[PDB]
């Protein structure tokens, strides 16, 4: 069928910033409408309006997808006949793609068989999925503490430089290359040089072969772009991966990166629309809008959809409207610490404030499940500790405390690990640890059999042998240095 | 319905916090003068009359009974909130989930020390009043020494 509103002609009324009202004579189109402004103005680049809110029954307030330059009152504009649509299936994999989805890989013409509005309805209640899986990063904090689920919601939360980039690219290393399934990977907002650098990692890796099959797809709308893109990229990458899910069932992987963008961008656009800030500054609608973009990231019977998303906390504040609304639309949560950064910790997961909807007895290992609460109770009772530590000395602590405490900082320089990302910033091999060595490793530091061992053995290393084999190397070392001095006399 | 017919209902609400964020965003875009973090000034009364229809009905009209059970969330132990506060000056009592008590291996995480009931024993069973008062009593003292 055809719309009814297709080729309605409206002009221009009212421009502010990257909000535009529109005056159609015969109507205004219905809402998410996309709109295309005729008049030549001047432009280097065509430019398109999305229907966003009905001031009459003849003028409608749009949001601009390209810069608003040179543009003019009275300036003709013709509706498209339906919202925003981007390609979909087979066509689009090893291609990169921007909001309005036009490729921008300066390649041959996609050529996709159909395509679908970014704007879709959420599945409902009886689409829902029943299945728990245990996804093995191969990262020990998350392995152990705060276990991924396969087809759930994944959530880093973190403040400007700590590392959230670093682990989205060894989740992707970890799983992405030798995953079954498709990936998606929505740059939301964020630096250009990254899309670079993960298109080039991937041609590299041959997960996309543009000479082959690929696997992949890239939607990019990055910090250059004005506010009204970086609203709808997410919304495009997650239409190709609901149509991924959907009509062909299979598993997808879809890394946003940062989803924060979105909500900031929300918030920009509704600061023209003419709205009541809310708490902050922050939209009246944001928990709406993070409600109809999140719930449609799911899986449902036909599919699953593993969603890993980075969460920008501003200034450190993880009270702030946007990464406080966003923990509850989260299966896992993984929350890390500046201070951690600092103390030479990484990752700086934070595992207190982390939190999985799989750590259960019925889901996961029981031996699993006892070792991950046993590291937690330690590692609270270690940061009660510290409180008294800090203040007046190692010194006033019960004999038993003092035990409790050197446990406590042998698993938390244990959880640190290096990621094979990282070596240039850590200068070490990074490693990849087994879920089962890392269980066993834990249990059996948490019964004492390795109070021997030095505190850094267990610094930036691997499984427990690799926490021996430093531990052989340091006494080995002091054994020199001891032989030095004897020497001397 | 249960309750004017001489029926006992439980009614859960999962939860409040989010109806207050809800019904600001409804106040600001249908342009409401905000309050108190761009709140509503009348969310107070939301809460208010929401939770004054919960009742126990005296024999005369049936005695059936609503009991409530809103639930609330806060944001690193802070009871200072805005929302936090209003409902917790209107139910008969509140049971603390402590953050620290959840990861300490405690769970349920209840905070006995926060929490408490206004309705006291009278909600209590004959079998279990002798037992809760002298439990009270040992773990009150238990806890001032300890
Ligand atoms: N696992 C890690 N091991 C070693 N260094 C790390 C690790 N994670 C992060 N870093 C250090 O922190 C820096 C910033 O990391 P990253 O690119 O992940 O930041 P971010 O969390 O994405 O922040 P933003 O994107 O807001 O700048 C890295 O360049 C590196 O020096
Ligand atoms: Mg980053």
């Known amino acids: ?489 | 319905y249960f309750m004017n017919r001489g029926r006992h209902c439980l009614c859960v609400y999962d939860d409040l916090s989010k109806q207050a964020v809800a019904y600001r965003q409804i106040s600001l875009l249908l342009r409401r003068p905000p309050g108190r973090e761009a709140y509503p000034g009348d969310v107070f009364y939301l809460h208010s009359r929401l939770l004054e229809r919960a009742a126990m009905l005296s024999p005369g009209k049936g005695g059936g009974s609503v009991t409530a059970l809103p639930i609330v969330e806060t944001l690193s132990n802070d009871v200072t909130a805005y929302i936090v506060t209003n409902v917790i000056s209107i139910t008969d009592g509140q049971i603390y989930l402590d953050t620290k008590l959840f990861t300490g291996g405690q769970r349920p995480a209840v905070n006995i020390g926060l929490s408490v009931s206004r309705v006291g024993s009278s909600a209590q069973n004959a079998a279990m009043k002798g037992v809760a008062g002298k439990l009270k009593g040992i773990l009150a003292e238990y806890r001032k020494l300890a």
């Not at chain 1, 704007?119 to 990063?137: F, I, M, R, S």
């Not at chain 1, 910090?223 to 190709?240: D, F, W």
């Not at chain 1, 290096?418 to 060595?437: C, I, K, N, S």
Request: proline share 4%; hydrophobic share 40%; aromatic share 6%.
């Open chain 1, 1 to 489: 069928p055809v719309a009814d509103h297709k080729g309605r002609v409206g002009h221009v009324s009212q421009v502010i910033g990257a909000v535009v009202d529109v005056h159609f004579a015969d109507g205004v189109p219905p809402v998410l409408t996309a709109l295309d402004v005729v008049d030549k103005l001047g432009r280097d680049e065509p430019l398109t309006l999305e229907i966003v809110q009905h001031l009459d029954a003849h003028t409608g307030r749009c949001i601009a997808m390209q810069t608003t330059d040179l543009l003019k009152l009275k300036a003709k504009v013709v509706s498209t006949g339906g919202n925003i649509s981007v390609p979909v299936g087979r066509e689009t994999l090893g291609r990169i793609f921007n909001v309005l989805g036009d490729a921008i890989d300066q390649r041959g013409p996609v050529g996709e068989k159909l395509r679908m509005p970014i704007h879709a309805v959420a599945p409902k209640l009886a689409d829902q999925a029943a299945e728990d899986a245990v996804l093995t990063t191969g990262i020990k904090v998350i392995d152990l503490i705060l276990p991924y689920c396969k087809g759930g919601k994944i959530g880093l939360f973190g403040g400007a430089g700590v590392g959230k980039t670093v682990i989205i690219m060894e989740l992707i290393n970890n799983v992405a290359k030798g995953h079954g399934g498709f990936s998606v990977f929505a740059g939301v907002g964020e630096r250009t040089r990254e899309g670079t650098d993960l298109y080039l990692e991937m041609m590299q890796s041959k997960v996309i072969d543009l000479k082959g099959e690929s696997k992949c797809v890239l939607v990019y709308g990055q910090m250059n772009e004005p506010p009204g893109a970086r609203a709808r990229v997410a919304q495009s990458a997650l239409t190709m991966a609901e149509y991924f899910r959907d009509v062909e069932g299979q598993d997808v992987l879809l890394f946003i990166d940062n989803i924060f963008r979105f909500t900031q961008a929300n918030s920009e656009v509704s600061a023209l629309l003419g709205r009541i800030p809310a708490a902050v500054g922050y939209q009246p609608t944001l928990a709406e809008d993070l409600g109809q973009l999140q719930e449609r990231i799911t899986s449902t019977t036909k599919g699953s959809i593993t969603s890993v998303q980075a969460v920008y906390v501003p200034a450190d504040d993880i009270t702030d409207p946007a990464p406080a609304t966003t923990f509850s639309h989260l299966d896992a949560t993984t929350v890390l610490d500046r201070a951690v950064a600092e103390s030479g910790i990484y990752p700086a997961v934070n595992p207190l404030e982390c939190a999985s909807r799989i750590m259960d007895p019925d889901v996961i290992s029981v031996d699993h499940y006892n070792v991950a609460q046993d590291v937690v109770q330690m590692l609270t009772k270690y940061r009660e500790l510290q409180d008294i530590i800090a203040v007046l000395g190692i010194d006033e602590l019960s004999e038993e405390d003092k035990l409790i405490v050197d446990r406590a900082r042998k698993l938390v320089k244990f959880l640190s690990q290096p990621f094979q990302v990282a070596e240039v910033f850590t200068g070490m091999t990074g490693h990849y640890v087994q879920l089962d060595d890392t269980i066993d490793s834990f249990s059996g530091l948490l019964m004492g059999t390795y109070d021997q061992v030095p505190e850094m053995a267990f610094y930036m290393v691997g499984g427990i042998n690799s926490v021996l084999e430093k531990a052989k190397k340091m006494a080995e070392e002091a054994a020199e240095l001891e032989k030095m001095r004897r020497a001397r006399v």
